[model samples]
Structures are given as structure tokens and as C-alpha cells.
Target: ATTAKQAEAVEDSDINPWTGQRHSERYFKILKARRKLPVNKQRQEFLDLYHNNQILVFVGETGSGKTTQIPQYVLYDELPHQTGKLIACTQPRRVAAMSVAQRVADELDVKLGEEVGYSIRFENKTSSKTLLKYMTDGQLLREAMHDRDMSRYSCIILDEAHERTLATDILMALLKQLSERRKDLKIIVMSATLDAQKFQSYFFNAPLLAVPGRTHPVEIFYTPEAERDYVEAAIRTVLQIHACEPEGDILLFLTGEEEIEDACRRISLEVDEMIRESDAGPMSVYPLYGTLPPHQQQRIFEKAPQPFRPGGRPGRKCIVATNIAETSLTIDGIVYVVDPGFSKQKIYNPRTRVESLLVSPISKASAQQRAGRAGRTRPGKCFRLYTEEAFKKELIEQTYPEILRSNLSNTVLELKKLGVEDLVHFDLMDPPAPETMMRALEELNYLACLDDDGELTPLGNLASEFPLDPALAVMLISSPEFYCSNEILSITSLLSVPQIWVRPANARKRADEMKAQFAHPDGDHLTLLNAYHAYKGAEARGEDMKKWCHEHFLSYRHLSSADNVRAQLKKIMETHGIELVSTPFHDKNYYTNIRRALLAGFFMQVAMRESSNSKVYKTVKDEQLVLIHPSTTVTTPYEWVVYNEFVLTTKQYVRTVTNIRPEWLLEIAPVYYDLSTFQKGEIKNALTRVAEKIRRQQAMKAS
Candidate 1:
């Protein structure tokens, strides 16, 4: 470490060597305000604790300035340039990392991508001179795969650690282990909630530091009775707030994108009527969600509607948003929060091996977060549509951690690749169910990602390199053998992204018609490939790709994202010596080759028709009854099919399905299709017949 005098001289330097420029006037102004933040008041306390401990738990509420200021404090002490190492901060989301990095870059009076930058999936803005870096937790984990000791940084800070996202949880455990191995490295766990004790205990009783946030107090109000229809109650509450509450912007929390948009329309219609009929002030409503375009999402931050005249009744802006506003983002000037006390959360069923979204009651932690939003800019009020009794009795104290609620196949593979030998004792903050872990191991074994010994195989290691599910990675690895790796790469890319097909509420028929233009008689997977081919063709012809996508009722954003994913996957494949090839389109076996390739990873996902005339089907091993989704384009009545996913909608529906030959199951995956181990049922009998037919055909060919 540098002496106190040397550090002071370096800090008081007139020029920033990292940026090669004199500090601008704006830097002084931002620095002046930044020094007044609550975190700055405790800087010496934080540094003292940091100097004494290898790891520290920091509690800083919203607007505490910990996210941006703490890193700078570390930069001054660590003297990263002198040590020839960097300081890193990790966020759970990409926007937070990118936005915060830019803010810090501005505060330092340096251009972004210079001294301070961010690295997220598919985007890296940093260069060799970068001293402070912001990145998603997953990016750092990815880097750790090559450098397990994480020696690239002097200090690593995990922000928003209370969220307990999969990456954050894994990183915390990894850092705990590394701290013992590398006593020179320093770590900080920062959170906005009261989960500091959990972090401290998990980190071997690390010292804790708490910093109060700068925000006005919020008064919360609850309903007298339970709300059976939260949507109706939310609407009523918004109108009431507009009519009775003081002049301030309003924020109403809803569940999903569709619900938020619907609520926005309803609120706007009602506000118009209130102005015309009740002589209420004007209001502008905006919908906010993750899927909306960036330009549209930015409109939520515009100034609220103004009154008709200075003395007339004041107007306000009301934002109808999804749970994204609860945590992933924060909007200032929100004085009134209308909370219906619910949000859409993802739930996984280990028994059925299915994951779906459900609208569930908000947790006490979530409700507190929502209420805090109103207090960001000024003293505010939060109107809860649900009864106070429900708030106390019905809600969970905290949302279930993501690790507990997610499919662990990818996570398990990641752990194995990170050199975690004993998963049972991997030291998670909140371990998932034993059954969930078992299911993940079983699924990975089926995908050949793990061998019979429960160890990562060469294929498993390769599969872990791609940010895809084990099955998809295995499929792509096996595709070159079928001479269709190029085509399969496109299919895999499309599958990894959100749905590219766009079906509008008003133009469903036209959208369906446009989708039919890319329909493949074999399966939805091939249809996706066909659409991607046309998209490429359009791009090669110099046609406006966005316009072409729009004309074809496709999501340009999702398709572009798929293209980006494909590029990343392709680079990995080339680096690792995976062949990229394609069968001749004119050959009769072209489509057949691709169809057979699907079974390499998906043979276990096959299903057989129950009867010739019936739409019902039975899964190969699970024997679950299902039906072809109504969205299928396959017209022929194929007896057997390979499905991509099992959907639990109104009925058990097999979606993204393609017709397959029953013999392919025995030919491609004989070990998985062994008759002796098969259950005695219609599926087994049918497979037996197909095996016999194959034997007869082989005998004739040999003769």
C-alpha cells in the first residue's frame, strides 16, 4: 500500500492519467454534491472496516449513493493503477451496470469506455486503461471460469446482494471461498434491504456498516376490506388519488406487460371522462415494462402534464408499470404509489418439470420497496388497494430467491464448470430443494452433460461454454455430424431468444397469414429456420430489415437479438474447433438430416399419438397425456413427434413440435430406448414394433 503522503499527492493531482485530460468544471460540481451523500459521511468508517477485514457487508438504502460513490472511494485507496489491478462492481441487471458506469464516468470528468466502463453479455465497452469497471454478475462469473482465483481485480463489490439472483448467490459463495485462498483481495456486499445480517453471517461474520439514505418519509394507507378484483380496485384508487390527493406524479404497479398496457388505456379513458364530466384536472398515463422499446420507455420520465393555466387545477402524470419498476429501475418525482399488492412471478414445479408465470401476492419486502418509491423526491403517500390485515397475514416476508424458483440445469452445469465438485455442500445462501437439485442432475445426465459417474464430460464442459441449456448445447454439438450445424445454429439462436413471431391483438389473422409464408410441413423448428433464412435474404438484398420484419409480423428486436446470440455462439464454436457445416439444400436428405439431428438431445422428449383420429398424445417416458397446440402447421398425421417444450396452459399442450419416425428413437438413442428398461405400455409396444421392423429391414439390406 502507498504511504499516506504519496496517496494524497496522487489524489490531489491536477490531471487524471487514466483519461489523459484535465478534470473539467462539471467534475467539481458533481464531486461537491457527491461528498454530501450519506455514504460519504461514513467513508472513513467503511475504509477502516475494509482495511481490517477481507469481506464487509454494507447496508445502504435507496439514494444512499453507495452504488457509484463506494467504488470511487475504493479506487482512491486501492490505487488500482499502482497495483496493476482493477476494481469491479457487479449489478444484477444490464441497464443498471451500464447506466451507473456512465454516471460514474461523468462524475470523474472522463469519457465512458476510458477509465470507467461496463461489460455485459454481447457488449464490452472497456479497454486496457479502464481502472473501474461495472458489469453484470453473470459476466464476472463467466470471467471466473478462466481465472478461478479472480486475480484481475483488487476489490470486487456486489451491489443489490439482497436480490439473491442466481449469479449473485453463486458469486457470493465463490468469493467467500476465494477470500480464504487470496487474503490480499477485498470484497464488499451491498444491499438496499435489512438482509445485511444474512450476508455478514454467510461471509464468516464480516463487519457490517449501515448508511442512512436521503429520502422523504412516506405515509402508507391500506384498505378496510380485502380486494377481490385488484384491477378494479387499482383503477378506483388511481381515480380517487387524482381527485382527492395533492399535486404530484402517480405510479401504479400492475403484473404483466399486457395488464400494464390495458391498465394504461383504462386509466387514460377514465381520466378523460373525469376531466369532461367531473371537471377534474388533466392526466397523462404511461405504461412501463421490460419489453417496451427504449424510446417508449423513456417517455415515462418526461415532465408530468401541466395545468391549463397557472392558477387552474394542477395536472399530473400517472405511470402504470410492471414489477420492473419495483426493483430493476427507479423513477424520481413519484409522490403517490398505487399498489394493488401483486406482481407476476415465475414458479417452477419440480414434479411436473415445468416452469410458468403466475400472478402472486407481493411479499412484505416487495411492498416496502414499492412504498419507498413514492418517497424518493418528496414526502409522499402510498395507497394500498388490499386490506391491512391481508398485508400482515397473507404476504410472505420476502420473495423466494431465484435459485429456489428456477430450473437448475443451467446453474448446475455452471457450478460444475466452475470446479465445484460436491454440489450438495456448495454453500449457497439459501439452498434449493434437494429434489430440484436431483432433477437438474438427472436432466444433465440425460443430455450427456454429465457421465454416469456424475462428473462433467468433455461434451458437458463444451456445453457449459455456451450460455444455453444443456440440451440445446448438446444438440448444437451433434449437429455437425448430421451435416446441418449451420441450420441448427439458426434454430438454436431463435429458440434462445423470445418469440420472434409477432401476433397483434387487432391483426391476428393477418399475422397468421404472414407466418404461413414461412410454414414448414415438418415442424415449428424448421419454420423458424425458414423465417430466419428469409430475413437473411432480405438483408442481403439491401431491403430495410426492420421494415421487412414489420411487414412479416415479426419482432425485429428479438430477431436482432437472436442474430447477436448466434454471433457469440458461433465465435465460441470456432474457437473450440466445432465444425460449422450444412447439407446441400437440393439433396433429398437435407430436411431429413436436420430432423434426425433434433433427436440427438431431444429423444427423451418424444411423444406418440394416442390413436389415428384423436389429437391426444402420450409422452415417451412420463406417459403424460398431451395434445398438439392449435398453432401447429403440420397437416400430416404422423404417429410420433419430437416436441421442444411442454406447456401447461388450459390443457397440457406440446408446442413447437415436429413429426418424427418412431425408428429414429431406437436408432439414435439405443441406450435411452432399451426395451428391457422400458415401461410396459402402448408406447413400449409401439417402439417394440418399430425395432422389429428395423431389424427386418437391416436383414434384407445385408442379404
Candidate 2:
């Protein structure tokens, strides 16, 4: 085993060879604090285990500094410079990957891109000289698709393993298999919770290491009865804490954007009243969520509110946020936390073939994580808006793993592309339901991503290369045949990003009016294409894009992200020799070609009108009843339509809808539209009629 002296000798070169610069003073200053981290105290022990074991399980709680420090320790020992190999660490979120890589780069005293850099979707900051790389777990899995052996990395660390994201679970199983094939490679599974045992046993009972976090104790409080309205209760608790509790910032957990914004407004309003009536200190309230602009999200870290007078009721700030605060982010000086004990979690129903976000009770692990946020800076308190009994009995031990709640069709395709021959035998920490696996296989088979033998086809392999769902990928690939790949590419990119249309509660009418400017009578897909074209035109004319987006009630961030996605997907298509083509704009077939192209991948998603005048429709295959979402731009009611998504809101609503002809379905996807294979229904009869009409037309043309 390598000793401390050998590891020290391995780190002889303090200068960055690529940059030709010595370590900076700031690096040493940061290193001083880095060495004081709890993980650093056990660096020698970690090195000993890392050198001896092929795989190791590491458990570190919040503030343990495992995420940033452990990889550096491995880099020192692995001596990637000498081996000409890289060390990779995977994070579950893009922001974590990027922010942590920047932190590590600063600590290493080297240029980020040269020595320590990050790679995420559409962004690659690493260079050929990068020895230590940080990336999202999904990014690494994509890399493994082509390089099955992962030969470039000497050590690979999976951070936040306890989150049990799909990418992390697959990487764990993949690394377990890779360890046997490549004994020289080392694997580290680092988690924030006490789930290390499961990981250890999964990897043949690997050695375990635990490090205590450096956070103060958090006193938890429980209400006497359940709060019917969590948002109201959360607001009251924040005001109560601000008026009564010690001087410290507050963090209140809510469910979604609307709820958080509402609470922020109410809390701020009440704070003003309290200051006027009872001479309470000033309080500033900010709303935090995933969709908020980055600049606003950063405002949560600003200094806490100050007292209006010297020692006149300590002033503080309160942050009302969604579950993004629970794990993906953290803020210091949060001495009080108001937990409503609920969050919006994504749930999937294989029976209904639907995935929806529902407000659900949080697990004990999540509750503890929220409480820990308060104690990060000092001893703090957390107020749970439920009885202790509810917490212990009602709340589950941990959040259901993402594998159980997500649509597995994409995962199944990724695994097949990774060359996993027997998915049933693949060793995931928590295997998904067999029914879920079957649904995924069935879906992929229909999309022609897999053959009858359940193996990936050439189309499947190419589809997996793009960071898109199988349906979108298939449509993009088949678009060239319809002479609309260019337009389809833009629409696909728009669909991959968050909603670009921003409808403020106070300005819904105005937002809808602005959206109408780009509305196409054909479908929402073309409308999106139209909006994107206009945005690009504004940019081409040197107009202030942000100002233009604001004036148009559009989300500049999401629109910009769509542009990035488009460039990335375009490059992938070019690399795979997929032609980029379009029909002549003046030709009569221009929009017709684009409209026909929508059926290529979405044939299975078509719905037929239930009656001549009724707004209700039934899905072709599943026969589920749905209505056109009120937000759709397509006004002329067609007999058949292809929807981009199924939303389970007030009613079963089909969103991003486009009208299509029944004949187009049979023409674009004959196999799926085979009359004999479909269940006997009105949809089947309608498609059969369309097929007969097509044959009659063909015969007439021949005569």
C-alpha cells in the first residue's frame, strides 16, 4: 500500500505544468481551511483504503467537505500526471458539478480548464490537460456509451449517491461490473446519509469510512395539530420566529413557485404590519425556486436585514423556497427553518402511462436535511408544522428513489446502448418494478428504438447519442424524409427546455396577447418555431435580447437554453451524418411537410375527436379521454391531433398540441397503425377507413 511519504513524494510538483505558474498564495489560504475539514483529518485512512480496495463506500454528512476534498486526495495519490489518466467525480445536478469544480480548481491553485474542470450537458470546460474532472452523473454515463471500459479515468467518484438518481444508480451497477474487468481502476461511492451499508454490500461488501460533519446542533420543534394550509402556517411561523426568536436569518420550505411567491408576499406584508404596530425589526423576504433567474437566486446569500434602531428587535431575512433549498442549494446564517413537511415530487403511473407532479409528504431524511440548513452557521431551530407522531409515523424513512417514480423508457434505452445485454440481471441498488421495465421496453419497441429481440437497433444507438427522449430523437432523425429536419430540430430543442412563455399572475392577459403574435393556426410546435425565429431575428439585428424577451413576456433563460440545446443537438446530428434540410418556404408543401413530420414519432400519441362538435378526444391506443389544453394556439378543430404531452391537472389536458390527418398516421407509422394489431375501437375503425381511402387513391392514380 502507498504510504504517506510515497503520496507526499508523488505530490512533489507544486507548479501547474500546463500553465507554467507556481501555486498562488490564495490557494494556500484555501488549502489551510480545506485541511481543517473533517474529511482531511482522515485523509491517510482514506488513502490507505483507496489503495487497498478496488471499491470503497464513503459516508459524509453536510459540511463534511467530502464533495470537494476527497477527490483532491485521490488526485494526489493517483498521480494522474504520471499515469496519463484522469480522475472523474460525478454530481447529480449540473449546478453542483459546476460550482464544486470551480471550488476545487481554486483550491488546486491551477487554471480551471487545464487541471480541474467540469463537463455538463452543452458545456465542456475541460481541456486535454485536465487531470481531475467534475461532471454530472448523466454526462459520465453518456461518455461510457462510447468508451465502455471508461479507460480514461483512473479513479471515479460518485457523489451524492444516496440521492439514488437514475444516473447514479446505473453508474454504481456499471462500476461494479467494470471493477472486475479493470482491477487497476478505483471506485468511490460517497453519500451524505447513512446508506453506505447498502452500497457496500452491493459492491461485494466493500470497506466503509464515516466522517462527522461540522455543523452545530439543531433543535427541532413540532406543532400540536396538523396545519391544513401549509403555506399559511409557514408564513405565520416565519413571522413568529422573526418577532420572537433570536437574531438569525430564516428559511421556510414550501411546495412550488406559486405557493412560495404567495408566502413571500404575505410574510413581507405581515412583517411591515408588525414593525408598525409592535415595533418589530425590519424583515426582508425572498422567494427561491428552480425557475427563478440566477441573479435573483443569488440574492438569498446577501447580508441579512439590519435593525432599524440599535438593538431594537434584531432584524433578519426570510427565504421562502421549494425543495430546491432542501438539497440542491444551501445558504448560511439560517438560524431558523419553517418546514411545512411537504414538497412537490414527481410520480409516475405505469398503468395510466402518465407522469405528474403531486404535492406529497416529505420523508424523514428530507425533514432532517431541511433542519440541517438552519444549523450550518450556528445552533438553530426547525419548526415542523405537524405533531411529532406524524413525523415518526406518517413520514417514510427516505424519499422514494427516483428510479421508482420516473418513466424508465429513456433509462432502458441508455442501458441497452451501454451494452447491458441482460437488464433483468443488472445490479441496481434499488431495481425498478418489473411492470415499469416492461412498459419501457414496449414503448421503445413501438418507437423502433429496439428490435423484436429486445436489442438496440442502429436507430436506437443513434437516438441514445442525443440528450433527448426516444420519441423526440426518432422524430428528429426521421424529419429529413419529410424535408423538415431544420424546423423539427428547432421545435425539439424548444421542447427540451423549460417553458419559454412567462405568464405572471397579474399579467396573464398581456402574456397571452404577446404569445398570439407567434401563434400558428397549425399547432403549438410551429408556434414555438415561429417564436424562436423571431427571437433570433431580434438577436441578428443587434437588439437587446433580454429586453426583447421581457417585452415579449418570454423567459430569456429558457429561450437561451433552447438555443444551446439546438447547437448541441445539431452538432450530434452532423457527427452522425444526419442531413439538415428544409422545403422551400414559398412552396405550398412547406408547412405541410413540417406538419406531416410531427406524425413520424408521435403516431402513437394521436387522438381522435369523440364527436363532431365535442371538445373531448380519446387517445388512439390507450383510449384515455382528454381535452385540448386551453393554452393551445391551434384554433381550427381537426378530427385528429397529435399531442406533445399529457398533463393531469384540473382535467386530462393534452398540451403543445398539433392537428394531424388520420391518413398521416398510417402513412408515417404503418407498423404501429396496423389495424389487426390494434384493439377493436373507434380509433382502429377510423385508421382502417383511412388506409382503404389511401389504397383507392393509389389505384385511381395508377389508372
lDDT of 2 by residue, 159-249 (tens): 7777766787888889899999998899998866646677789999999998876746788999999879877888878888888888899
The superposed Cα distance between candidate 2 and the true structure at residue 633, in angstroms, equals: 18
- The clash tally of candidate 2 reads 0
Predicted candidate 1 versus true structure: per-residue lDDT over 1-703, tens digit per residue: 5443454355456786556678677777777666667787787787788888889999876766788888987887887447778899997766667767878898877879988998988888898879899998999999998999998899999987777678888998899889889988999988676577777898999899998766467889998888689998999989988888778989899998878888888988998998888778899998888777644666777788788677666798998988666753456567899899988887765433344568889888788878877765468888988888889998887778888887688789889988788786788999876876887788888777899988999989899888776777899988998999999899888877666889999999999999999999988889989999999899899999989999999988778878988999999899999999988899999998999999997898889999987889999857899998788878773899998878887899888889999988888888888899988999999999888888999999999
**lDDT (CA) per prediction:** 0.83, 0.83
Q: Residue 548 of candidate 1: its Cα lDDT?
A: 95
Q: How accurate is candidate 1 locally (lDDT)?
A: 0.83
Worst 10 residues of 1 by lDDT: 2-11
Which residue pairs clash in candidate 1? none
Listed per candidate, the RMSD to the true structure in angstroms reads: 7.2, 7.5
TM-score, candidate number 2: 0.70
